[PDB]
Scaffold this active site. Sequence first.
Site, short mmCIF file in Angstrom:
data_model
loop_
_atom_site.label_atom_id
_atom_site.label_comp_id
_atom_site.label_asym_id
_atom_site.label_seq_id
_atom_site.Cartn_x
_atom_site.Cartn_y
_atom_site.Cartn_z
N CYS A 94 65.02 51.67 56.77
CA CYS A 94 63.85 52.03 56.02
C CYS A 94 62.89 52.75 56.91
CB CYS A 94 63.14 50.78 55.41
SG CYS A 94 61.55 51.21 54.61
N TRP A 132 56.81 53.91 47.44
CA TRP A 132 56.67 55.26 46.88
C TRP A 132 57.65 56.15 47.58
CZ3 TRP A 132 52.37 52.87 49.39
CH2 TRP A 132 52.19 53.23 50.73
N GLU A 164 64.18 62.36 49.09
CA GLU A 164 65.02 61.48 48.29
C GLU A 164 65.34 62.12 46.93
OE1 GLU A 164 64.13 57.03 48.59
OE2 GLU A 164 62.19 57.80 49.22
N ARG A 213 58.50 51.69 57.21
CA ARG A 213 58.12 50.32 57.55
C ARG A 213 56.77 50.24 58.26
NH1 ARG A 213 62.92 48.29 60.94
NH2 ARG A 213 63.70 50.51 60.88
C1 HEM Z 1 55.81 52.37 50.91
C2 HEM Z 1 56.66 53.38 50.80
C3 HEM Z 1 58.06 53.37 51.30
C4 HEM Z 1 58.71 54.55 51.81
C5 HEM Z 1 58.12 55.93 51.95
C6 HEM Z 1 60.05 54.01 52.09
C7 HEM Z 1 61.04 54.87 52.61
C8 HEM Z 1 62.48 54.61 52.43
C9 HEM Z 1 63.53 55.66 52.42
C10 HEM Z 1 63.38 57.16 52.41
C11 HEM Z 1 64.80 54.92 52.31
C12 HEM Z 1 66.20 55.45 52.19
C13 HEM Z 1 66.51 55.40 50.68
C14 HEM Z 1 67.80 56.09 50.35
O1 HEM Z 1 68.28 56.99 51.11
O2 HEM Z 1 68.40 55.73 49.32
C15 HEM Z 1 64.43 53.50 52.33
C16 HEM Z 1 65.45 52.47 52.31
C17 HEM Z 1 65.12 51.06 52.27
N1 HEM Z 1 63.86 50.62 52.13
FE1 HEM Z 1 62.00 51.55 52.29
N2 HEM Z 1 60.29 52.71 51.86
C18 HEM Z 1 59.08 52.31 51.39
C19 HEM Z 1 58.81 50.97 50.88
C20 HEM Z 1 59.75 49.85 50.96
C21 HEM Z 1 59.38 48.47 50.49
C22 HEM Z 1 58.06 48.05 49.88
C23 HEM Z 1 60.60 47.70 50.83
C24 HEM Z 1 60.85 46.23 50.63
C25 HEM Z 1 59.85 45.45 50.26
C26 HEM Z 1 61.58 48.65 51.46
C27 HEM Z 1 62.95 48.32 51.93
C28 HEM Z 1 64.04 49.28 52.12
C29 HEM Z 1 65.43 48.80 52.11
C30 HEM Z 1 65.91 47.37 52.08
C31 HEM Z 1 66.18 50.04 52.25
C32 HEM Z 1 67.67 50.26 52.29
C33 HEM Z 1 68.07 50.37 50.85
C34 HEM Z 1 69.55 50.68 50.79
O3 HEM Z 1 70.28 50.30 51.74
O4 HEM Z 1 69.92 51.35 49.79
N3 HEM Z 1 61.12 50.00 51.38
N4 HEM Z 1 63.00 53.28 52.34
C1 LIG Z 2 59.67 52.82 48.31
O1 LIG Z 2 60.98 52.59 47.83
N1 LIG Z 2 61.77 53.14 48.71
C2 LIG Z 2 62.03 54.43 48.51
N2 LIG Z 2 61.10 55.32 48.84
N3 LIG Z 2 63.21 54.72 47.98
C3 LIG Z 2 64.14 53.67 47.59
C4 LIG Z 2 65.47 54.22 47.05
C5 LIG Z 2 65.22 55.37 46.06
C6 LIG Z 2 66.39 56.36 45.94
N4 LIG Z 2 66.60 56.98 47.27
C7 LIG Z 2 66.07 57.45 44.93
O2 LIG Z 2 66.06 58.63 45.33
O3 LIG Z 2 65.84 57.16 43.72
#
Ligand code: HEM
Ligand SMILES: CONC(=N)NCCC[C@H](N)C(=O)O
Lengths: 407, 411
Positions: free
Chosen positions: A106, A278, A283, A109
């Site tokens: 992620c 968000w 993405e 974070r």
């Molecule tokens: C606040 C804005 C956030 C941004 C900009 C963000 C950004 C991202 C991005 C770009 C990915 C890759 C998604 C993909 O390629 O499918 C990701 C994956 C992930 N995010 Fe974050 N995230 C955010 C909030 C969160 C929150 C609130 C949580 C948990 C409470 C979280 C947990 C994860 C997890 C567990 C993955 C891996 C998901 C998977 O393996 O498909 N994210 N995030």
């Molecule tokens: C904040 O939630 N995390 C994200 N920004 N994305 C979570 C996964 C979304 C997925 N990659 C999509 O393009 O719909």
Amino acid sequence: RFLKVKNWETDVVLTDTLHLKSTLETGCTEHICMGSIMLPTKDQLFPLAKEFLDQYYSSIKRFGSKAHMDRLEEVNKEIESTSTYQLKDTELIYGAKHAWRNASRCVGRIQWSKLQVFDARDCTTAHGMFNYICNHVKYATNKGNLRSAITIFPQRTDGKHDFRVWNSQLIRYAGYKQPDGSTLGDPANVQFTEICIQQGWKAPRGRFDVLPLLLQANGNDPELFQIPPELVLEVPIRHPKFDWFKDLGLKWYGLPAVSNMLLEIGGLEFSACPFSGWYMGTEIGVRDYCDNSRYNILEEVAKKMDLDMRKTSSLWKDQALVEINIAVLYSFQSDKVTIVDHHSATESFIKHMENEYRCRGGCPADWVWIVPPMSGSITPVFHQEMLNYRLTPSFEYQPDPWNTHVW
Amino acid sequence: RFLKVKNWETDVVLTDTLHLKSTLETGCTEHICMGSIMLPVRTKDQLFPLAKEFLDQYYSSIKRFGSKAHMDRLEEVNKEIESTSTYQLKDTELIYGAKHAWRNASRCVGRIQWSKLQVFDARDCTTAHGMFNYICNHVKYATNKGNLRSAITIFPQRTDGKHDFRVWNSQLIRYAGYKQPDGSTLGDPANVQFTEICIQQGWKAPRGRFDVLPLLLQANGNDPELFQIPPELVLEVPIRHPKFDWFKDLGLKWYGLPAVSNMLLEIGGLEFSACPFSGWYMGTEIGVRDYCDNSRYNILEEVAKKMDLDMRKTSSLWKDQALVEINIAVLYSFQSDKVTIVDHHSATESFIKHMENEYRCRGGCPADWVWIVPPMSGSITPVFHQEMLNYRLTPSFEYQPDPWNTHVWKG
Ligand code: HEM
Ligand SMILES: CONC(=N)NCCC[C@H](N)C(=O)O
Ligand code: HEM
Ligand SMILES: C[C@H](O)[C@H](O)[C@H]1CNc2nc(N)[nH]c(=O)c2N1
Ligand SMILES: C[C@H](O)[C@H](O)[C@H]1CNc2nc(N)[nH]c(=O)c2N1
Ligand SMILES: CONC(=N)NCCC[C@H](N)C(=O)O
Ligand SMILES: [Zn+2]
């Protein structure tokens, strides 16, 4: 066994010690690296509970205090007696924030400590789950000023009374295989869309149909619900320079809300734990729009730009990609819906990594997922060495419910 | 044991058994993945197994495993090792070895070409002047007036570690870098330390933005000596753009022949510390990395300015826009001048066909995803979507420390 990571652009070196706390396994060995692979009882439970409570009491600077020893004693009594235990609200909130903190895939974070935790452990029915989920959707959406949130349904018991959201995200578009052999809407969601249709959903059979929720309470058969449309914020996609872009008929939803993962805290398993933040722009604009197996729009866009599509070396695909991604960002920004570009998000992640190294001794990160799917080396994460390892509390994959459910 | 890799775009699943033949270590463990870390003498004892393993691989590839000729060769190498403590490769084994080091190079996206490699045996070389001559010959052959031909030149192997042959340059052809008093850099910042060494050794620097460095060549453990590659042998391409006529006035050019000269070739336990090899460029090496890395020529700002992009917010994606235009310019320039180059779409598509072939006929293809995925437009290339398994096979190309850090100066 203290490890160094170097940034090759800035020469900054960080020393990682946090990896030694890591417990779970990576899929790699001394002989083989699996870094690019997408998916690599009572006695079991007490060490896991102890490990977690120790880190919790350490975090509130009360390690080895009576309140510490008393809570350990109490849970131990409770596992011995009931074979499980119940987290205190304070522990639940700590656990969920740290599961985000530990999420090596992620990039967002830097936000980890700002997370609204909705305790839904008193939920008993799919209707109640629908209610909690609408409340989360509305809270997180906040009229476009998005706020991170997670809703946590009751934990696994014997494994036959599982809470599950069948959807992969709270909000996603339907996909339909046509007589043609082509796909209408989102091909990623064809199978789930079929399970919905077979369950009584009547599909508009369009390109961008918001799917119904399919919710499973207490191991029962799952049930369909329409999210109120006024709770689903969507953005029509236009371009700040190309007047024809809006004719493509594209839109996306504002709230990314992963709903198919499992939250593990202190050995307890929360199989339904939808969370939302968000979007980062890429993405939608690179992956959702341009993957060959997704909306796959590169060809239609390139044609409208009148690029020479005869040869790959004109970089017509690359040119269309940049334009599509400009439009996604412009559209969310114009409608005042929170979005982050890949330059901004990766810059913040480097700053987060430095914070984590300083205050925690490290930051698990998966380079393969962290580097954006366009323009990789012009973002600073490309040049940053990362160590990947598994800490708990964590978010884990779990198998799709329909392969598991006994109807 | 069987390992599967899946392509998430096509659902093609491939099964790897070749990883079982891997002995060397990756840097990873059960508890940690070091897949993004850039960098994660020899007894007569350890040497015979390594030779044996290699000769068994060679005789197998020629359908002569277990033959009298195979058995006599093992016997001969065994006798040579215990008598002289090392051994000499036959020419055919050296060719086989060098091609396989390439076939096994998990960071190389160009491996579809591995069996087409011109091997120049320079093991009779004794002096730096001799090395200079071999290297000019390699460059002229490889360049072939723009119709690039892959090649490697192999200098004598390590003996006691005190008589090493080394090319001190990191590539045969590269531009000088100069740190200025005001702290700015003229030329290529990647080559500043090496440039300072050349100057100290006696090179007269022209001090411009694209000065081809002299060769600094060490034969037989002796102090290195400087040589100028004849300018007529160094093919360069001025960079222009097909639509933007101001692009030429940026004053950009690059050289045609990418020729890595600082790696170590290991075959059958023998160590070839000087083994310059050359192929041809993939466009993004120059247009993304060499031109646009902040730590290299860093031209993004100057270009975007000339394109009149909105540069006040990153979310205009000005950097991404300029990036694509630069890369178009590089491919256009090389193609117009009939100098071999491959775009990142072509090269990755070819790699996937190569990888699939290798699974079917070899049982596997070790690949490093971090290096294989191009540094722009990652997910619109098919390699982004391909799961890969990384492991180390011999013969191999390996990193070695820079020679100025270890050389014992004779004075
Ligand atoms: C606040 C804005 C956030 C941004 C900009 C963000 C950004 C991202 C991005 C770009 C990915 C890759 C998604 C993909 O390629 O499918 C990701 C994956 C992930 N995010 Fe974050 N995230 C955010 C909030 C969160 C929150 C609130 C949580 C948990 C409470 C979280 C947990 C994860 C997890 C567990 C993955 C891996 C998901 C998977 O393996 O498909 N994210 N995030
Ligand atoms: C904040 O939630 N995390 C994200 N920004 N994305 C979570 C996964 C979304 C997925 N990659 C999509 O393009 O719909
Ligand atoms: C035929 C044309 C070739 C193309 C298009 C090609 C492509 C590439 C590219 C794009 C990289 C990554 C380079 C970087 O980021 O610095 C690379 C790495 C590599 N290539 Fe190839 N290559 C080709 C020929 C060869 C040949 C002839 C050899 C050896 C005989 C070879 C062996 C390697 C090795 C050992 C690396 C890793 C270098 C390192 O770790 O710095 N390549 N190649
Ligand atoms: C096979 C490969 O691991 C796969 O295509 C990965 C690569 N990196 C990724 N990175 C992110 N953020 N999201 C993804 O879905 C993927 N997919
Ligand atoms: C830290 C990271 O491993 C490093 O920047 C790598 C990433 N991938 C790469 N890929 C290629 N082909 N060449 C490189 O120099 C790099 N650099
Ligand atoms: C043929 O050699 N193989 C290559 N295509 N490149 C080798 C390394 C070149 C380096 N990346 C460069 O940009 O000069
Ligand atoms: Zn690994």
